[PDB]
Amino acid sequence: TDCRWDGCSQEFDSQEQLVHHINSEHIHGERKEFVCHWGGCSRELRPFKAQYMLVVHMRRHT
Amino acid sequence: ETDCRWDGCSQEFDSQEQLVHHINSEHIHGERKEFVCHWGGCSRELRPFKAQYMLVVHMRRHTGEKP
Ligand SMILES: [Zn+2]
Ligand SMILES: [Zn+2]
Ligand SMILES: [Zn+2]
Ligand SMILES: [Zn+2]
C-alpha cells in the first residue's frame, strides 16, 4: 500500500489507493524524471527534475 | 565527440554538430522510446521499457494488482 517510486513519500491504506496513485502521478502525471541513458554516465540513470537540466547535462557527453 | 552512446542507439557521425543535432532530435525531443520504473529496489535496475503500456503492466508486480 506504500509508494517506493524514487522521490515519492506517499503511504496509503489500500492497494486500490496505491494503484490509482501510481497511474495518476507516476504513469500519466506531469513528467518529473528526465534520465540520461548515455553509456557510462557517472549519474548512473539518476533522473533530473526538468528536461532543460538534461539538455544542459548532454553538453558533457558531446 | 562524434558517436552516440544513448541506450539502444549506435548512430555514428562525422562531426560534433551532427551528434548534437541527433541527440536533440531523437533522444531529447523525439518520440519517447524509454519508460523507466523508478520503484526503489526494482530488479530491472532502471533498465528502460520501449513503450508506456509495458511499464503499466510491469507496475502490477510492485502493487499486486490482478490483470
Ligand atoms: Zn508515488
Ligand atoms: Zn549523462
Ligand atoms: Zn543516439
Ligand atoms: Zn519496477
Swiss-Prot record, chain A:
Detected in testis (at protein level). Testis, myometrium and fallopian tube. Also expressed in the brain with highest expression in the cerebellum, optic nerve and olfactory tract. Isoform 1 is detected in brain, spleen, pancreas, liver, kidney and placenta; isoform 2 is not detectable in these tissues. The chain holds residues 235 to 296 of 1106 of the full protein. Interacts with KIF7. Interacts with STK36. Interacts with ZIC1; the interaction enhances transcription activation. Interacts with SUFU; this inhibits transcriptional activation by GLI1. It comes from Homo sapiens. Induction: Isoform 1 and isoform 2 are amplified in glioblastoma cells. A zinc finger (C2H2-type) spans 1-26, 34-61. This is Zinc finger protein GLI1. Phosphorylated in vitro by ULK3. Acts as a transcriptional activator. Binds to the DNA consensus sequence 5'-GACCACCCA-3'. Regulates the transcription of specific genes during normal development. Plays a role in craniofacial development and digital development, as well as development of the central nervous system and gastrointestinal tract. Mediates SHH signaling. Plays a role in cell proliferation and differentiation via its role in SHH signaling. It is linked to Polydactyly, postaxial, A8: A form of postaxial polydactyly, a condition characterized by the occurrence of supernumerary digits in the upper and/or lower extremities. In postaxial polydactyly type A, the extra digit is well-formed and articulates with the fifth or a sixth metacarpal/metatarsal. PAPA8 is an autosomal recessive condition characterized by the presence of postaxial extra digits (hexadactyly) on the hands and/or the feet. It is found in: Cytoplasm; Nucleus. Residues 49-57 are annotated as: Interaction with DNA. Belongs to the GLI C2H2-type zinc-finger protein family.
